[PDB]
Amino acid sequence: GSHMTYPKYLLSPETIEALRKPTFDVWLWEPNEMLSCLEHMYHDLGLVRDFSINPVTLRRWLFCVHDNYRNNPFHNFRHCFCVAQMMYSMVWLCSLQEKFSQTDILILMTAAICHDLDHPGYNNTYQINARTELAVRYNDISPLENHHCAVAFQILAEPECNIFSNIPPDGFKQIRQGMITLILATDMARHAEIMDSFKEKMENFDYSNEEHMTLLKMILIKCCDISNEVRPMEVAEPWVDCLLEEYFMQSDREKSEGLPVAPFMDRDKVTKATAQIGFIKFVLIPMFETVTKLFPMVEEIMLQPLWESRDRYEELKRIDDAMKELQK
Ligand SMILES: Nc1nc2c(ncn2[C@@H]2O[C@@H]3COP(=O)(O)O[C@H]3[C@H]2O)c(=O)[nH]1
Ligand SMILES: [Mg+2]
Ligand SMILES: [Mn+2]
Numbered sequence: 313g314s315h316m317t318y319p320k321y322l323l324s325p326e327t328i329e330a331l332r333k334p335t336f337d338v339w340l341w342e343p344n345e346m347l348s349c350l351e352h353m354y355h356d357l358g359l360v361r362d363f364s365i366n367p368v369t370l371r372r373w374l375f376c377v378h379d380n381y382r383n384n385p386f387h388n389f390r391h392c393f394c395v396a397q398m399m400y401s402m403v404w405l406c407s408l409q410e411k412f413s414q415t416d417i418l419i420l421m422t423a424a425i426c427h428d429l430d431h432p433g434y435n436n437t438y439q440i441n442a443r444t445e446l447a448v449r450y451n452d453i454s455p456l457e458n459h460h461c462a463v464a465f466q467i468l469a470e471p472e473c474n475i476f477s478n479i480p481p482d483g484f485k486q487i488r489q490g491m492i493t494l495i496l497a498t499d500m501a502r503h504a505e506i507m508d509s510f511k512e513k514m515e516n517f518d519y520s521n522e523e524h525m526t527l528l529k530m531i532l533i534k535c536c537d538i539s540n541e542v543r544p545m546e547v548a549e550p551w552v553d554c555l556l557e558e559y560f561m562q563s564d565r566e567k568s569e570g571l572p573v574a575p576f577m578d579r580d581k582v583t584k585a586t587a588q589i590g591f592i593k594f595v596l597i598p599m600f601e602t603v604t605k606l607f608p609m610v611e612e613i614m615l616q617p618l619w620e621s622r623d624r625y626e627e628l629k630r631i632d633d634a635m636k637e638l639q640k
Contacts, residue, residue, distance in 0.1 A: 321348045328352060334401040334539070334613065337547055338394050346393045347374045350425060353400050357421065362414045364478035373473040380429050380463055385557035387431035394543075396424040398536040405614075406607040408532075411519050415483070416529065419490035422475075423533055426464035427495045431456060434562045436501065441571045454499040461495045490529070497530035498537050506530055507599065514602060531603060541592055541621045542600075542614045548621065552584045585629035592622040 314324070321344045323331075330336050331349055341349070354360050354370055381389040399420055402408060408417065432446075439447040439455050446455045465488070467473050476484055497506055510527045518524045540551040559577035566573045575581055596618055604610045 320345050323348050323352065331397065332401060332404050334398055334405075334542055335544055335547075336397055336401070338390060338397065338543070339547065339550065343378060343389060346390065347371075347378060350374050350393065350396055353396065353421065357400075357403065357409075357417055358414060359418050359421065363418060363476070363483075365475045366477065369473065369475055369477065373467065373475045374425075376467050376470070376473045377425055377429070380467060382431060382433065384431060384433035385561075386551065386554040387428050387433055387558065392425055392428055394540065395427060395533075395536045396421060398539045398542070399424040399532070402532065402536065405609060412525075415486060416490070416525070419487055419494060420529060420532060422464075422487070423491045423494035424536055426467075426491070427457075427460055427498050427533065427537065429460040429463035429467075431460065433558050434565070436499065437574065438562050438566065438571070441566070442569065454496055454501070457496050457499045461492055464491065464495065490526075493526060494529055494533045497533060500538075503534070503595065506534065507602070511602060514605060517606060528606070531599065535599060535603060538591075538596060538599075539614075541588065541596060542617050544617070545621065545624065549584075552587060556582065556584070556587065583629065583632055585625045585632055588625045589622060589629065592618055592625070597622070 318324070320342070323345070327349075331352065351370060351374060354365065355367075359365065360367060360370065377392070378389050381387075381392060403417065403420075408420075412420075434442075436447075436454065436456055438444070440452050444455075446459055449455070450458045468476060471477065476487060479487065506527070510531050513521075513524045513527050517528075540548050542548075559582070560579050563573045563577040563579060565571075566577075576587070597615065600610060600615050600618065604615060
């Protein structure tokens with residue numbers, strides 16, 4: 313309803329409102345628009361207010377985080393924007409502010425933004441098997457994730473980027489610990505371990521028990537990370553071709569360098585459909601089923617799109633298969 317046009321990085325009222333929901337079209341926007349969005353999130357969640365974040369530093373820091381993501385097909389700035397924007401969505405969808413402190417929100421949000429810093433676009437198995445410098449550096453223990461985390465704090469140690477410069481040190485120590493746990497929790501090698509620890513607490517969940525809360529925070533960041541398929545089908549789908557783009561780059565290389573190839577990155581055997589049916593049925597549906605025991609509104613906003621996406625890929629596979637029966 314506006315009297316004149318604004319530049320793009322002046323988000324409109326429509327965009328700001330849309331940003332609260334997981335229907336948001338994470339493809340519409342260029343990096344500067346995404347930066348303004350992340351910025352708005354910090355103000356709107358009251359984090360600028362409650363941690364005295366100098367607002368120019370907030371901007372400088374985000375631009376700096378941006379600079380430290382690489383131009384990978386999948387593990388890129390736009391992916392961290394998805395993860396952060398889904399977390400933002402979740403704060404509203406689950407009323408996380410009723411249950412969590414502002415320090416906990418700061419952790420969730422900053423860990424979402426930082427959780428894949430400087431990802432080289434080849435996973436931990438490649439690093440370990442190739443004996444990369446990262447694998448040697450981190451002794452084969454969640455090397456990518458430990459690195460993302462280290463880069464996060466290197467950025468924050470530069471004073472012009474230090475969004476925590478006005479938090480007292482006890483606060484800093486606490487945010488740092490949370491963020492480390494959360495970013496490390498994103499390594500999928502630990503998925504069943506973390507899911508088991510959570511389910512065990514979920515036998516008698518207790519919002520006043522820090523250990524219960526830490527596990528909830530780890531499940532929350534894990535949901536957000538692997539949440540592409542929760543989004544509308546037109547927004548979700550292009551991500552799968554990016555993921556395969558990386559997975560196939562890795563397996564080419566592995567083949568070429570004599571290293572073990574994983575069959576789920578095997579060009580000859582893998583399909584969008586075959587990639588997503590299992591990942592939806594046996595990773596995403598069940599994780600969100602348990603979150604849903606705490607947050608039942610999660611069913612309708614997030615389990616439904618997943619059921620729909622599983623059903624669609626199942627159809628797709630039926631036709632892809634028909635189609636390779638014209639071949640070979
Ligand atoms: N098959 C499939 N795997 C995914 C999908 N989304 C995330 N993953 C995997 O989950 C991993 C989680 O952390 P990263 O974001 O470091 O790398 C991710 C992918 O390997 C998806 O939509 N489909
Ligand atoms: Mg990761
Ligand atoms: Mn990620």
